[PDB]
Design a protein around this ligand. Sequence first.
Ligand SMILES: Cc1ccc(NC(=O)c2ccc(CN3CCN(C)CC3)c(C(F)(F)F)c2)cc1OC1CCN(C(=O)c2cccnc2)CC1
Ligand SMILES: Cc1ccc(NC(=O)c2ccc(CN3CCN(C)CC3)c(C(F)(F)F)c2)cc1OC1CCN(C(=O)c2cccnc2)CC1
Ligand SMILES: [Cl-]
Length: 270
Amino acid sequence: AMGSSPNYDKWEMERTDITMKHKLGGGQYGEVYEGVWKKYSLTVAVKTLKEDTMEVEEFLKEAAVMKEIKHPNLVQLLGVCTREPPFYIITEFMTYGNLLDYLRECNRQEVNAVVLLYMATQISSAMEYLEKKNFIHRDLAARNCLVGENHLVKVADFGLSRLMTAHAGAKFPIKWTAPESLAYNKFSIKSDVWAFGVLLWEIATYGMSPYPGIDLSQVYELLEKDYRMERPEGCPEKVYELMRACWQWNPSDRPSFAEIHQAFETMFQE
Ligand SMILES: Cc1ccc(NC(=O)c2ccc(CN3CCN(C)CC3)c(C(F)(F)F)c2)cc1OC1CCN(C(=O)c2cccnc2)CC1
Ligand SMILES: Cc1ccc(NC(=O)c2ccc(CN3CCN(C)CC3)c(C(F)(F)F)c2)cc1OC1CCN(C(=O)c2cccnc2)CC1
Ligand SMILES: [Cl-]
C-alpha cells in the first residue's frame, strides 16, 4: 500500500488511470462526468463531490453501499477513489442515458406497450433485490433509471434529491414521495413502493410529469382526500391496479417488492 498498511480495499482504483471528460448533460445532472478508464479503453461514468460545501459522509456511505450491490438491473460499480479529494465513484456508462428522457424521445413503434412493460418488470426485479438486502432507495423515479443495449434498464441514483429535458422535480421530488415521508419524514421500503407506483405512471405515459397541472403545494392534500392519478391511456388495467396498490395511504397495506415482481409474472396468465 501507498500508506504502508496491510488493510486494503480492492475497489480503490488509481486515479491516474481515469481520464475525466465533460460533465454529463453539461451540468444539469450535478457532479457526474463521462470518463475513460485508460487501462481498458472503457468509457465510464464518474461521480464526484465538492467537499468544502458537500457532505463527504454521505458520499463515503454511498460508495460503501454500492460495494454491496450486485444485480442485473442495478447500475454496476467499477471502482472508487475515496482516500483523498477529489473523491470519485466510478460506474459503468449506460449508452442511452436516463429513462425519463429516453421515454420522452423514443420511437414509440420500437418502444411499444410491450417494451414499457418489460421496463417495469426489470425495475421491479431491481427493487425486489434491494428489499431483500434491506436497502432503501429513497429517490426512485424515471430520472434515476438508466437505459442500455437490448432494452436493458437499471435502477441508479444521480443523487440530486435534497429531501432530508429539465427534470424540475429532481431536487424536491414531492410528487414521488409517500404521504408519511412528507408529513413525518419516514422513508422506508414502503415509501419506495409508493414511488415505484409513480414511476410506473411515468413509464405508462412516456414520461409525463405526475399530477399534471397540479401545484406542489396541493399534492399532499389531494392524496389525503384519497385522490389518485388516473389510469393512463393504453395502460393495462392490471398494471393500474398495481399502481393503485402502491399508493395505499397506509404503508402496511402496500405490497412488497417481492409481491410486485410476483404479480407481474402471474398477472397476464403467464
Ligand atoms: C457515476 C455514478 C456514481 C455512483 C452512482 N450511484 C448510484 O447510481 C447509486 C447509488 C446508491 C444506490 C443505492 N442507495 C441509494 C440511496 N439509499 C439511501 C441507499 C441505497 C444505488 C442503487 F439504488 F442503484 F442501488 C445507485 C451513480 C453514478 O452515475 C449515474 C449512473 C451512471 N450514469 C450513466 O450511466 C449515464 C447517465 C446518463 C448519461 N450517460 C450515462 C451516470 C449517472
Ligand atoms: C417543496 C415542498 C412542497 C411541499 C411540501 N410539503 C407539503 O406540501 C406538505 C407536507 C406535509 C403536510 C402535512 N403535514 C404537516 C406537518 N405535520 C406535522 C404533519 C402533517 C402538508 C399539509 F400541511 F398540507 F398537510 C403539506 C414540502 C416541500 O419542501 C420541503 C422543504 C424542506 N424539506 C426538506 O427536506 C429539506 C429541509 C432542509 C434542507 N433541505 C431539505 C422538506 C420538503
Ligand atoms: Cl470543494
